[PDB]
Design a protein around this ligand. Structure first.
Ligand SMILES: *[C@H](C)[C@H]1/C(=C/c2[nH]c(/C=C3N=C(/C=C4\NC(=O)C(CC)=C4C)C(C)=C\3CCC(=O)O)c(CCC(=O)O)c2C)NC(=O)[C@@H]1C
Ligand SMILES: *[C@H](C)[C@H]1/C(=C/c2[nH]c(/C=C3N=C(/C=C4\NC(=O)C(CC)=C4C)C(C)=C\3CCC(=O)O)c(CCC(=O)O)c2C)NC(=O)[C@@H]1C
Ligand SMILES: *[C@H](C)[C@H]1/C(=C/c2[nH]c(/C=C3N=C(/C=C4\NC(=O)C(CC)=C4C)C(C)=C\3CCC(=O)O)c(CCC(=O)O)c2C)NC(=O)[C@@H]1C
Ligand SMILES: CCC1=C(C)/C(=C/C2=NC(=C\c3[nH]c(/C=C4\NC(=O)[C@H](C)[C@H]4CC)c(C)c3CCC(=O)O)/C(CCC(=O)O)=C2C)NC1=O
Lengths: 160, 161, 160, 160, 161, 160, 160, 161
């Protein structure tokens, strides 16, 4: 969160929160309601977002879902869809927090290690999250979509 | 550290569930308290030295602690004690901002009781002193956020005990 | 139906429907497929929902199934299930219509008079309707549950 | 009073009181002493009459006073006894009045709406009044029971 | 007739000017918060009977008002009292959906104080019953929607007093 | 009794009864007549109280009186009501004594052993005693009902 | 297990394992093959055992499925069947271990406390486990059923 | 263990003052509210099993904690949880009668957080259960004594946090 980011930095500097940082958390608390609304719409339409974006991912890269790909067979392809669902959930956490901090902990650390060892192509995973970002943009208003776009963008950048 | 936002989202994450409507109510409550909390944090930030001064006067000074052989005697130890009281004030204010006592648990309380018992620091005097800080802080930041600061001050007292 | 209510207003006005009224008709036309899909789910799982809701209603208001209650004995309890099924089917018809007007015409007009004369408690019948709404929420998607819950809630208010 | 009801009819008719209407007023004047004596008996035996009636009503419908019932608990049971006592006092007023005019304005207009709002069972209230009628017949003379029973019966019908 | 969007349009019509950026922003805010308002309004309608029951229990019941001679002693007065609260809530929810406090003043608050004064209804008791409804409605609707509902409920109370 | 409890505790000290203990004896002995009246009312209406408690207990817990339960058949139901009658007799004893030592001695020591050996459900017995409390309190005056509630409350608290 | 019970007694008496205890362990390790075979049959037939025994439990004790009983309604009945499944799993564990202490540690210590809190009747649960023993005896050979039945017998005895 | 009465007299003793008018006002308040405290204690005593049952149902049953691999799984562990919940209820009732949280501090909270951290007991779930008991007991004892109880239940929640 913005609050945790400020407090961690200031704690390292052994300094009561700088006046500017106090203003920053003041702005965060005012903006919080908009953040919660964005999370509300994304989580309410979570099944739509994951389902249609997953269809887009498999359509764009059929080799990934073809036999011999990591998501080959009903079981494996279902788990791949579950990973897309996981990353949407983490994005909602990030939107509420107002910073990547939650997503950059729960996921996005050692994702390369986990997936590369898992066998999956991480660029393909990035394409899947890109598709989710497009669907979310359709479901969001222009300014709201920009912020949620930022959190999705952080995910895909970490993937790449 | 977990602030209230991080605690809510991590509690939901452990179960694996998206942020529920009840969790949203928790987060909304934190956002509602945000203004009074930030205002109080600025008050403590500017008046930190006065809070420590008043508290050390109210409780610690003119007692057996500061007489020769009392552990706060010697200018080195009087300086050290006021340093520790300001540690408590700074981390308590951090905790007021974040809304969760995990900062206190992580950065203050874990291991402090053992170090204090090893060094010989009187632990009753420390608890009385930080409670005196609570009285001063309640006056400066007002009752509503004095309600809030008390929760974290009491947390420190319980940890030291 | 939405078209039916618009027709009533147009009949009094003797004037063509305004652009907003036409937009309402267009919205109903756009969501006709969604209404049919929700009805498909409800009708398919109708019997299971009825039996589950009966268990919930009996737990919440055991006086109805207690000795001296209206639904004391197998025959009376079966009549209670049939009445709940009639209400649920009426709710499905109203959901397909998109307006509570079809359900209101079929029943809930004079329902207080009829049920009170029969001797079954109106509050207990309303509680059964609430249990049906909860079961539908469990068995349906959130977006469809939003519309279905709204029509259910109209039935609950009429029962009140 | 009976005179009050006759006056209302005469005012609507825009005519002086009819000779037969005055004759009934004369009968009410004659029966004032007997009606007052019957009312005095009811008021004298008030506590025991409604105590026995409350026991009978709770015996007839044990769910009024059982857990989950409207009057579950000592305080709510006392409130139920008060409602019965309100009705008993109204019946005594009506016996003195010689007409249904006193009761109708108090406890027989909108009573169904009020009881439905609070949640108390209207049929059980009606049975309680019937139990009062039986107790009053036991505690009154035979023709005194007939007249008092008539006023009680109008109250019971109003509850229906 | 007055609604939030309609009132912006009406002010613009008085000017004769084409839609200003400020007018567009205010109308956009109405469009933006309509979703939360609509969901809460449906919830209110569903639990309307429970709300008035809770309100009279919390404020107007088990007191002298419903005891003899209290303007609710008789069933007619009681039925009218719960009916009056029901109308208060219905037109208030109408207005809450609309977003504009003008509607309630047009219908609910037009001569209401004079009528209540003439009939002998306690103005203060009605105000406290409205406040009790405000608490119950806030509980059912939730904080975000209940805060919006509370403003228009409070406008009704202000008209009464 | 108050007298024997005070004497026993004084005996533990071996001191002659303290002035405060003697004052307690004075208070209890002075209020004894009112205690006698409370016990008299409960025993005078012992039949009505017990039977009403049976009605309410079975209505809260139909499973105890349903087939396959302990109170199935007239004889078994009668024995259940006999147990309720025994505990009402104990409650009157405890009221007169002014202490709960007689109730404990006669009926509450080892009740769990006795009842589960019989197969009877102890929590259901607790509900029945709660019904006895409510019925007896309704019969009693407000001042009297407060004390009788305490004596019933020890029984239900032991039952738990 | 036999080994752990022997070690526990020897540990509490500071005693290298006695020759008799060693002999008990020797017999147990030899019978291991038969033990595991019995457990395999029981877990393979776990669905049949639970289903048939649950039918027997409800038939023998209708009150538990009657209104007011613990297992009233589909979900409550499902949890009751799940508890029966839990106890069968514990019995398989006990058979493999050759001692009842795994059953005691998991699910039998404090069972009275847990079920009393939940409202469940302990003797009725014992009826269910007895029915499971009958079904398992039908599915097992005579020599096998005698050994497995003893573990069922301990469960019902502790839960008597 | 120290009541409000013992607390008042002990504070005056520390100051070496006879019971003054202000402290005597404190005592008058406690003596006046003692009747409500006593009756509520009787209510909770009778319904202890029901209070614990309903709280365990409202917050703990049918969840991860009771399912295998959770803390309350196994009858051993579940019986321990209901035992500890009753302990929290019983000591809260002691504290309500006395008027002071010192009984909770000395007997319950004197290491509770460390014990639960040692055994792995979920502190958050315990807090949820105690708050559930707070709701249920408020219903049973009424609001007037429910608030007085609630302060001590909140004390336990804060300590375990
Ligand atoms: C005197 C020349 C100046 C002055 C001083 C002043 N000091 C105090 C109070 C305290 N001073 C000390 C000092 C020491 N503690 C130590 O361990 C050592 C070294 C061995 C020293 C020098 C302490 C501890 C106190 C606090 C009280 C106590 O001893 O417990 C005061 C009183 C301050 C007050 O308002 O409380 C004063 C006035 N004041 C002057 O005007 C001089 C210039
Ligand atoms: C079936 C034979 C009887 C019956 C039982 C019944 N039980 C419950 C609820 C629970 N039972 C358990 C049991 C266990 N937990 C354990 O860890 C173990 C050992 C491994 C056992 C045996 C638990 C935890 C519950 C609580 C719910 C949950 O699992 O989370 C119910 C539901 C009661 C309720 O309303 O909560 C019922 C009905 N009922 C019967 O009629 C039979 C006689
Ligand atoms: C119930 C709400 C939650 C829970 C708790 C749980 N606790 C234990 C075991 C212990 N509890 C204590 C606690 C206390 N000691 C005290 O003196 C007091 C105050 C009077 C308290 C609260 C202790 C010391 C133990 C260990 C010894 C024992 O088992 O009694 C367990 C059992 C854990 C075990 O390993 O056996 C459990 C499960 N568990 C939950 O799931 C709830 C959220
Ligand atoms: C002059 C006409 C008139 C009447 C009669 C009247 C009665 C009346 N009964 C009430 C309550 C009540 N009335 C009942 C009634 C019953 N419960 C039962 O089990 C029985 C079947 C039944 C009566 C025999 C109950 C249970 C309550 C309390 C509701 C509650 O608080 O839960 C209340 C609300 C609480 C209060 O007194 O403030 C009123 C006003 N008021 C009036 O103006």
């Amino acid at each position: 969160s913005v609050v945790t980011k400020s407090i961690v930095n200031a704690d390292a500097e052994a300094r009561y929160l700088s006046p500017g940082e106090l203003d920053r958390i003041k702005n965060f608390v005012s903006t919080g309601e908009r953040r919660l609304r964005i999370a509300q719409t994304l989580t309410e339409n979570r099944e739509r977002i994951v389902k249609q974006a997953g269809d887009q991912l498999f359509q764009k890269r059929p080799d990934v879902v073809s036999p011999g790909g990591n998501a080959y067979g009903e079981e494996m392809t279902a788990t791949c869809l579950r990973d897309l669902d996981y990353y949407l959930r983490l994005v909602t956490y990030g939107i509420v927090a107002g910073d990547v901090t939650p997503i950059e902990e729960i996921g996005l650390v050692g994702v390369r290690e986990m997936y590369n060892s898992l066998g999956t192509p991480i660029p393909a995973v990035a394409e899947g999250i890109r598709a989710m970002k497009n669907v979310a943009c359709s479901l969001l208003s222009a300014e709201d979509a920009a912020e949620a776009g930022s959190y999705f963008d952080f995910v895909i950048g970490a993937m790449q | 550290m977990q602030d209230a936002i991080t605690a809510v989202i991590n509690a939901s994450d452990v179960q694996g569930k998206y942020l529920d409507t009840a969790a949203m109510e928790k987060l909304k409550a934190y956002f509602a308290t945000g203004e009074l909390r930030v205002r109080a944090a600025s008050v403590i930030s500017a008046n930190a030295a006065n809070i420590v001064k008043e508290a050390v006067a109210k409780s610690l000074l003119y007692s057996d602690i500061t007489r020769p052989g009392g552990n706060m005697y010697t200018t080195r130890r009087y300086a050290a004690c006021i340093r520790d009281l300001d540690y408590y004030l700074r981390y308590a204010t951090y905790a007021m901002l974040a809304g969760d006592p995990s900062i206190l648990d992580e950065r203050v309380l874990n291991g402090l009781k053992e170090t204090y018992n090893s060094l010989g620091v009187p632990i009753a005097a420390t608890v009385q002193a930080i409670q005196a800080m609570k009285e001063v802080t309640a006056s400066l930041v007002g009752a509503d956020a004095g309600k809030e600061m008390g929760i974290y001050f009491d947390y420190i007292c319980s940890g030291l005990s």
